[PDB]
């Protein structure tokens, strides 16, 4: 049981040391495209960049850059795109990526404002009758419906490629109750949220990869993908107790840097996987 590992780390007060060792073991790959001067305004944070090998490329000759990475989990047979929260000038790029990658779902794990600062642009329309047009990427986006619950909001959006007039329905799953500081006390509502995303078909292989973000696209987004993958692997393997969350995290870190940003996020991820395993 990773629960016995969990209790052991708790009693010995070693979360910080376990987390720092993951930081030390983590892959280091170049982010040369990200660091090009012409892309400075396409990155929110100077210390959060997509690796070149796993970056999502926009299908355009001018500038193909977006701060987004494909995390491809072979054994679990799950793929996720992790990205930063859109910036005022990269909302058109964001929706272009969603279109070109054939994503069905977008998972948002932050509020537009937290700690009194803007953590991303308002990249989706708040009213049915006030649609958004992204002129740079020739896309139209329309709020079709919105269902606000206590811990999350799910929206249906229609995305139209104005060039070909094709439309698609995108589901927007917005977790709205992650605290400004720290992690949630109990993983129950986060797990419920994950199950709602799963139930929608947004994580399924008949669609492109789900797009997941918070402000930077590594902390809470890492937590979401790490929990999902670990739980899938416990369902798939002959020996479920062989699923090692540290090894999965390190594997995911081959595709995007810095996934899980604090020791508290690590502890929380353990908690989510443990409680989620017991529910299943
Ligand atoms: Mg109205």
Swiss-Prot record:
The keyword Aminoacyl-tRNA synthetase does not apply. The modification S-nitrosocysteine is found at residue 214. The modification Cysteine persulfide is found at residue 214. The active site is at residue 214. Oxidized on Cys-214; the Cys-SOH formed in response to redox signaling reacts with the alpha-amido of the following residue to form a sulfenamide cross-link, triggering a conformational change that inhibits substrate binding and activity. The active site can be restored by reduction. Ser-49 is the major site of phosphorylation as compared to Ser-241 and Ser-242. Activated by phosphorylation at Ser-49. It is found in: Endoplasmic reticulum membrane. Residues 2-276 form the Tyrosine-protein phosphatase domain. The modification Cysteine sulfenic acid (-SOH) is found at residue 214. Keywords: Acetylation, Endoplasmic reticulum, Hydrolase, Membrane, Oxidation, Phosphoprotein, Protein phosphatase, S-nitrosylation. Its EC number is 3.1.3.48. Expressed in keratinocytes (at protein level). Its main location: endoplasmic reticulum. GO terms for molecular function: cadherin binding; enzyme binding; ephrin receptor binding; insulin receptor binding; non-membrane spanning protein tyrosine phosphatase activity; protein kinase binding; protein phosphatase 2A binding; protein tyrosine phosphatase activity. It is an enzyme of class 3 (hydrolase). It comes from the Eukaryota. GO terms for cellular component: cytoplasm; cytoplasmic side of endoplasmic reticulum membrane; cytosol; early endosome; endoplasmic reticulum; endosome lumen; glutamatergic synapse; mitochondrial crista. One of its GO terms (biological process) is cellular response to angiotensin. Interacts with EPHA3 (phosphorylated); dephosphorylates EPHA3 and may regulate its trafficking and function. Interacts with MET. Interacts with NCK1. Belongs to the protein-tyrosine phosphatase family. Non-receptor class 1 subfamily. This is Tyrosine-protein phosphatase non-receptor type 1. It comes from Homo sapiens (Human). The lineage of its organism: Eukaryota, Metazoa, Chordata, Craniata, Vertebrata. The gene is PTPN1.
